Ligand binder design. Structure first.
Ligand SMILES: [Ag+]
Ligand code: NA
Ligand code: NA
Ligand code: NA
Ligand code: NA
Ligand code: NA
Length: 129
């Protein structure tokens, strides 16, 4: 599923991401935009052989099992394919664990390079929320 901007903002809000560990909703929408272009089906291979999955590009190196990332962890206790559903529940719940692990949203490369320190409120402009 490719979400609209305000559609994703609403889904993220209902799932408890607005101000989760102090990160406003706009941060999460911005991160999803630049990680997956709002596409739940997005997958991308990393140089180490792990893969990033879904709307928030969650990586198999630490967070999920994709059956092809040897010597990795599965800290969200999920198959990576779960992160590809049209419904974002699994991605959100796993993201909450990631953002809580010590590094905050810096875990998301796209967030650190494209959202951090910008006017992220713009990402929810005009959205009925
Ligand atoms: Ag949902
Ligand atoms: Na893909
Ligand atoms: Na992989
Ligand atoms: Na994801
Ligand atoms: Na893994
Ligand atoms: Na940018």
């Amino acid at each position: 599923k490719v979400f609209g901007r305000c559609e994703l903002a609403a889904a993220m809000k209902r799932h408890g991401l607005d101000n989760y560990r102090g990160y406003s909703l706009g941060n999460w929408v911005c991160a999803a935009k630049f990680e997956s272009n709002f596409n739940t089906q997005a997958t991308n291979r990393n140089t180490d052989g792990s893969t990033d999955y879904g709307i928030l590009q969650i990586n198999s190196r630490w967070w999920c099992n994709d059956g092809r990332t040897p010597g990795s962890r599965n800290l969200c206790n999920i198959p990576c394919s779960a992160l590809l559903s049209s419904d974002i529940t699994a991605s959100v719940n796993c993201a909450k664990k990631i953002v809580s692990d010590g590094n905050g949203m810096n875990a998301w490369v796209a967030w650190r390079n494209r959202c951090k320190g910008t006017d992220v409120q713009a990402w929810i402009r005009g959205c009925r929320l």
